[PDB]
């Protein structure tokens, strides 16, 4: 009976909540109450990457920490040499509604997707000296909101059809599909070991998936509205979410519950992007009020502001050695901060 | 810098030039978002994404029909939103009004003007002439409504006034709605879109030039 199934589901929810409550002894703030304050964090715009003629939806850093790819709604992917601000590549797109982009760890490929429901893989290393689309991954029934390369032949995409998928670019087939979200999945983040990933959807919950197996391991709730950003802690045992209730939250996989809340009274706009520092001590979040805030992740005290964008900050990344922060925005400008 | 860095910078400058020409070519087109509904006949207005292109008076228009709180944010830089309403069916009129209110009051669509096409006026005229269906049942205020065939005229004016009240209840002039009456056989909808977009761009220029 439907009523009996609902009763069993709510009983299990109560049991899980009680287990989480029992497992909680002291909040993260109490533990990190004696930690020395991080102090004011001042970053100045080292580089301003100009050339996009429309709002920027996504950016991704290369593993070399020097090359980055940016996606813009004018149907162009631009690969920047951030040291010299030289445009290495400019990739025309079949659809100009791109809302995500990725850079392969090897650096041979970039990916993008959007309202066309397709992830396109582009080969940067061709014998013809030209960038060409390698594979087009079709099968998602909603807009692609994120994509992350696992290796040169495996990619994970989160779509607007409330599903996340793992692809095999060699054959262009969905190897496994991750289901369970009841809202549009907006972003995903891969663990350092690339065995698990976390995805945040429009149902105000994040889920931890097993790439090899293909089912959700844990579900994390606590946000009051749609989750727009997510990113792993550098050690892979935690992650931070950025949502539309003007709040960032930190979750621990082992504790399977919330850890700390990153909110302020005069912040009412939603968070569009979230990223950690190299050591995980600083959390950087992009907001709709045109600014980026730096949060002391251990103490939930704001450490700085990356003011300098005149529109919504849509993307935000940190290099693999932590030497810079690149924030793109809806004013068609990218900035490198240090 | 070195010789290779000089050549790399020259290639970057060539890329910059090509991007500038592409943007100059793409800035002369006007992008529109078609946001009707099923039974509204929005497809038969101008003679994944159902993109349709038309040109009047040597001005190019690009219309995007996606086939919602998240993907609607991509269309915040469009020239205007073309909202098509089936005015003959009173049952779905309130749903159309709610949809129009949601689009109008959105945070990222708060500066976009809406070209409202009240489609299928001929069917509405036939329905009001028949008298079988009364607008007063669905909309009580139509019973005590008098216009500023007279019955068809007051029905049309009440239907348009509902949407106009929704549009003027907020905005403070940052964007306005351009109501129109369409019979799904009228061939002047492209001209109406062009004139309304020209007025929208004129008002935008007046705003950005510190003249308004």
């Amino acid at each position, epitope marked *: 009976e439907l009523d009996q199934l609902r009763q069993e589901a709510e009983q299990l929810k109560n049991q899980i909540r009680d287990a989480r409550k029992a497992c909680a002894d002291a909040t993260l703030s109490q533990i990190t109450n004696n930690i020395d304050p991080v102090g004011r964090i001042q970053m100045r715009t080292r580089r301003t990457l100009r050339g996009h003629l429309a709002k920027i939806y996504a950016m991704h850093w290369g593993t070399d920490s020097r090359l980055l790819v940016s996606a813009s709604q004018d149907g162009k992917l631009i690969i920047w040499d951030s040291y010299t601000t030289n445009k*290495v590549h400019a990739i025309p797109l079949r659809s100009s509604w791109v809302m995500t982009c990725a850079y392969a760890p090897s650096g041979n490929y970039v990916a993008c997707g959007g309202l066309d429901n397709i992830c396109s893989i582009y080969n940067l290393k061709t014998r*013809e000296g030209n960038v060409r689309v390698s594979r087009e991954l079709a099968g998602h029934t909603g807009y692609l909101s994120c994509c992350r390369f696992l290796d040169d032949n495996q990619i994970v995409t989160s779509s607007g059809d409330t599903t996340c998928a793992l692809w095999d670019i060699e054959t262009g087939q969905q190897t496994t599909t991750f289901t369970g979200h009841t809202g549009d999945v907006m972003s995903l983040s891969l663990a350092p070991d690339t065995r698990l990933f976390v995805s945040g959807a429009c149902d105000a919950s994040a889920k931890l998936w097993d790439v090899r197996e293909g089912m959700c391991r844990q579900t994390f709730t606590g946000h009051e509205s749609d989750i727009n950003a997510i990113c792993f802690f550098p050690n892979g045992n935690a992650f931070a979410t950025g949502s539309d209730d003007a709040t960032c939250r930190l979750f621990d996989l082992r504790a399977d519950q919330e850890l700390m809340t990153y909110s302020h009274d005069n912040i009412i706009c939603g968070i569009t992007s979230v990223s950690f520092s190299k050591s995980g001590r600083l959390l950087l979040a992009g907001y709709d009020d045109f600014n980026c805030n730096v949060w002391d992740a251990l103490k939930a005290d704001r450490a700085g502001v990356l003011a300098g964008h005149d529109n919504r900050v849509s993307c935000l990344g940190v290099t693999d050695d932590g030497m810079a922060v690149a924030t793109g925005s809806w004013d068609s400008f990218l900035k490198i901060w240090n | 810098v*070195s010789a290779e860095d000089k050549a*790399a910078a020259e*290639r970057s400058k060539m890329i910059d030039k090509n991007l500038r020409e592409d943007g100059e070519k793409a800035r002369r087109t006007l992008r529109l978002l078609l946001l009707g509904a099923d039974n509204s006949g929005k497809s038969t207005i101008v003679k994944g994404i159902f993109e349709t292109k038309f040109q009047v008076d040597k001005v190019n228009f690009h219309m995007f029909d996606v086939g919602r709180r998240k993907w609607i944010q991509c269309f915040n830089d469009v020239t205007a939103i073309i909202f098509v309403v089936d005015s003959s069916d009173y049952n779905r009129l309130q749903e159309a009004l709610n949809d129009f209110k949601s689009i109008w009051n959105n945070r990222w669509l708060r500066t976009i003007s809406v070209i409202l096409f009240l489609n299928k006026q001929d069917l509405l005229a036939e329905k009001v002439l028949a008298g079988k269906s009364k607008i007063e049942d669905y909309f009580p205020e139509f019973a005590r409504y008098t216009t500023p065939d007279p019955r068809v005229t007051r029905a049309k004016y009440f239907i348009r006034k509902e949407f106009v009240d929704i549009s003027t209840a907020s905005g403070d002039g940052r964007h306005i709605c351009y109501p129109h009456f369409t019979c799904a056989v009228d061939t002047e909808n492209a001209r109406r879109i062009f004139n309304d977009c020209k007025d929208i761009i004129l008002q935008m220029n007046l705003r950005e030039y510190n003249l308004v």
Partner: single-chain antibody
Amino acid sequence: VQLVESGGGLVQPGGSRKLSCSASGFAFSSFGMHWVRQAPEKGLEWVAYISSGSGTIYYADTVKGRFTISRDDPKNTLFLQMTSLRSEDTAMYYCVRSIYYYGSSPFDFWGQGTTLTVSSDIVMTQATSSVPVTPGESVSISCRSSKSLLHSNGNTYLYWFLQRPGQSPQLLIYRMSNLASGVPDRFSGSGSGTAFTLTISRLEAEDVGVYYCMQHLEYPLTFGAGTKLEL
């Protein structure tokens, strides 16, 4: 990729001859194109260079004012106009493609070469010229430069080419340590700023030939004399 050059042959001294090269199989408009000579029984010698889009043009000091380099991007053709040819321009002329961006591999592909017969800058001293060797024995090819090839940005602009007997040169190592695509992992490059060594861990029958060193620090590009490995 394919570069084919035509226009060589016997030329009377003081005359004029035009060399044309047709590029097929790659985006010819995105590559800067060079010309390289090789006089018989002598090493290579860079001649000219035209940038992508013909923006930047350079000539060797021994050809400047007489040779003219041009490209036809729609026709994917590269030309070299030679006027007042004298009795030392007799050589085999190679067309070379080279694209410059961060991480690129210039001088990757070399044309077949056409033969023409008639009648201050960094010097790269390659010292040894012939070294006998047996297959399976590791070889080190040394190099020297008058001026340090290491730049302030951290790139040591030294290029290693191999010219097999009766074949065009092939890029083995770019910017000192980078190993070109399609090259076996046996080859390796090392050297800090002026003394460079080319290492071949295992020698096969296909590694015989003359190995050349090139500097790309400054636009008067110069080559070494070449080391010949024979069995």
